[PDB]
Design a binder for this molecule. Structure first.
Ligand code: NA
Lengths: 190, 189
């Protein structure tokens, strides 16, 4: 029956806005003060949950990866979808989280661009994000009858194209960069 | 007896700025980083570039000119087929990026940072990609592609180049870059 009220706690609201800021502007272009101002809490309440910016960075990527893992799991466990349809829906899921949501970039892509400036803890979480995506893509493609080598190569082309397509689409509002990703999928996969 | 081949202060500032941006990104370097790198006073940097934005604009403009000259040498090379021109383009990019101390594309770096940048720098970054996309489109049109397909394929190629470079440099996985070449080789006739 009655559940607890659906109010986001302070930690969750910090994570959600940090995620948004990183996706829009990049890790080296937001501060705790930006978050405090955005959701009207004390900057000291941010330091409370995340003593350093690094702590928040690690936690944001970890949370985001968990969310994407669930989304992907739901696609690959859908028995009515062909392998090709799973890849198509993967791209739709990325669009929902990126270009469609206030012209955001992929969180992973943003950290990849900033990689050399990041603490190692964040670097390692960013690598984990891509490893999860690539493994998921490779696995789906293996169910389509592709051999191991071809599955890994195509998985890497697909994520490269997704990242580069999003990067360029969001500069111009030029959807054709994103259409190109879909065209590659549709023309390359069986 | 020619003048001696010494890079002037402005030239060395631009070169080190370009490298810092390609390694770490525009929002992760300062003039102090440049001063420490080449042992000049920060006041000397401001002399040439009063604000960081002025340096950002100059670096992209200069980098774009360098890429334009490279692309010109490729397309005036008559021994190269259209496909070979695109292969050699990606080889030129590799020289300036992955091969040079694991750097990212300067344009790609500014694209990632775009929302945080002054409009002057946004516009320079767009000019960089317009130059590349137009050049690729033109090579493809010499191979018989129509306007819409030339443009679509050029945008796929640069999208894949940018993404491949982005991911290859995270842990030295060459196969991300092999994938770019495979796409070029398998798609262009
Ligand atoms: Na960036």
């Amino acid at each position: 029956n009655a559940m607890p009220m659906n109010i986001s706690n302070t930690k969750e609201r910090i994570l959600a806005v940090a995620e948004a800021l990183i996706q829009k502007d990049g890790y080296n272009a937001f501060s705790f003060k930006d978050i405090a101002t955005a959701i009207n809490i004390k900057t000291a309440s941010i330091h409370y949950h995340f003593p350093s910016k690094e702590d928040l960075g690690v936690a944001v990527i970890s949370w985001h990866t968990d969310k994407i893992a669930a989304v992907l799991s739901d696609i690959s466990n859908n028995s009515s979808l062909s392998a090709k349809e799973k890849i198509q829906k993967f791209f739709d899921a990325i669009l929902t989280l990126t270009y469609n949501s206030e012209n955001k970039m992929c969180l992973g892509g943003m950290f990849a661009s900033d990689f050399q400036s990041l603490p190692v803890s964040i670097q390692n979480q960013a690598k984990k994000f891509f490893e999860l995506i690539i493994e998921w893509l490779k696995g789906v493609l293996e169910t389509n009858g592709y051999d191991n080598e071809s599955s890994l190569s195509l998985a890497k082309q697909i994520i490269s194209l997704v990242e580069g397509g999003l990067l360029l689409a969001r500069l111009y509002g030029d959807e054709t960069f994103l259409e190109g990703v879909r065209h590659f999928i549709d023309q390359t996969i069986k």
